[PDB]
């Protein structure tokens, strides 16, 4: 790891200042959700490190008081020119926090405001062990490991060594179902997403990818636990559900939600990490690999849906500059 080395440098420099006590992940768009696994990892595993996950806009208007020499700030920007994210790195450096930047473009303006820069694999055919989300997690595993010890580091590196094969085989495996999925939902206008736990970020991104295909109403990305309380999303609209079924410690919540939806006869596309072979990653760390699986399989489904859908030229279609 580049990350192992980076964190080792940071842990050395800040020792005299009282150590790393706080980690802040800061990004917008698809870079924000990509750090959700790092946030979930530190919340689950840490005893003496705090973690905060911020949109760049909220961070620079309302930075925490702990921002200082005992904080590390990890910023991400695919192209390295998001103005709010650059200001975050700058505000961090002016408070004496070391900044790690994550970017595809090493020339970018962002780089000039980072103490350390890490890049990632990108595009069709990429190695998943080196992708943006995995680098964000590796920052968290190395900060924990090098400050207080991480009981399951070797299981984790075992996981990193398996995820790429798992994902490539999963994408092949969903191909026929994706086609059928496309025919079944090509005439819907709105679809809900459901998820829980450390892969939720991937579901949130998928909810926005569906929105970008369907372009009608941006629907709620429902946490699985929330069906059992108060209102639930079953009405005369007959909206279908795109259901992220996780491996790991929140699988029991997901199963309870899936059974609920089944008792109401809903239309549900289930995408099950267990059915896609995640289960060879050990129980200790499998929660943290859900995101990399789903986020790299959903494009197969999204491509099929797009291709199954053609629009009259009388229908206005929208495009955006989306932040990877």
């Amino acid at each position: 790891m580049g990350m192992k080395e980076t964190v080792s440098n940071i842990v050395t420099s800040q020792a005299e200042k009282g150590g790393v006590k706080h980690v802040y992940y800061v990004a917008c768009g698809g870079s924000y959700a990509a750090f959700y696994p790092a946030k979930a990892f530190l919340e689950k595993e840490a005893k003496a490190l705090t973690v905060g996950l911020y949109n760049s806009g909220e961070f620079i208007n309302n930075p925490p008081v702990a921002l200082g020499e005992n904080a590390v700030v990890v910023v991400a920007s695919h192209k390295g020119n998001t103005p709010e994210t650059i200001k975050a790195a700058e505000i961090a450096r002016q408070h004496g926090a070391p900044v790690i930047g994550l970017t595809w473009i090493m020339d970018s303006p962002l780089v000039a405001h980072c103490d350390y820069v890490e890049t990632y694999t990108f595009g069709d055919g990429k190695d998943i062990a080196g992708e943006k989300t995995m680098k964000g997690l590796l920052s968290a595993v190395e900060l924990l490991q090098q400050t207080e010890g991480y009981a399951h580091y070797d299981d984790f590196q075992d996981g990193v060594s398996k995820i790429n094969r798992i994902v490539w085989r999963a994408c092949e495996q969903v191909a026929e179902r994706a086609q059928a999925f496309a025919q079944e939902y090509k005439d819907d206008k709105v679809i809900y997403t459901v998820a829980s736990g450390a892969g939720y970020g991937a579901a949130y991104l998928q909810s926005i990818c569906i929105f970008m295909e369907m372009q009608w109403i941006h629907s709620a990305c429902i946490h699985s636990g929330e069906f059992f309380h108060g209102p639930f999303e079953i009405t005369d609209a007959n909206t279908p559900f795109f259901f992220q079924f996780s491996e790991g410690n929140t699988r029991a919540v997901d199963e309870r939600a899936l059974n609920f939806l089944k008792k109401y006869g809903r239309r549900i596309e289930v995408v099950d990490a267990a059915a896609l072979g995640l289960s060879t990653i050990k129980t200790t760390v499998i929660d943290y690999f859900n995101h990399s699986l789903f986020n790299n399989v959903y494009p197969v489904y999204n491509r099929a849906l797009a291709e199954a859908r053609q629009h009259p030229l009388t229908t206005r279609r929208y495009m955006w500059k989306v932040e990877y």
Copy 2:
């Protein structure tokens, strides 16, 4: 006992165990959203205390390793019978974490599983200074004050002393707009909510109230700062936006998002904290009072909407 005394007993009791290092807020449904401000408070203000906000089902299936003698867990259930929340209190005591319970029902099962119980004001004419969201926050302000010190404790107490009158006055103030809102939106099926910062919880809860009236599609509750980066929730559905315009540190984020929506000719109902008298609270602490304000003014709009308008008969968990 009240929060000040309850926290003193905890600091005393965990003194010889390493003291209190982590706070977990754990609830479901409306009680989850109600602890958003507490979480926001500790993440902004604490240098040495960690904070987590969990739904009970998540917490009981995936509890943090730091759950133990240096954690305080604050659980809330209005009727004190939500099973997941009770299980959360029990798991927390079994790990040796002091458990503070918030409930309206003082003989609920939940009380059997907490070390301390606090209650709150509820119902029309309640004192806002004692409402559930405010006891959540006060738990956080006392935890911070008695462990680490808090620079704005007195400003905070001042805010607490003002919020009741601010709220009941704002309720009267919006009454006529609420009627006009109900007429402009009575034929819509879906409406988005938009908010930022320490009061996001109240917008989330409003998203759920709108859906309970409209009963078509549960739409996104949009963070203001996500309208700076595409994609944007602007389509030919022409969905309107119920916009929570906060006072305090993220008011500039809100203002940018509102100007964007205006530039796009969207249909927007603006509820503005600065228009509704919140600005009497010191800017050092005003972020934390947005929730109490919006949460208590929304009902006026919601009742007007329902009046102006087979049904699903969902019950809310307060």
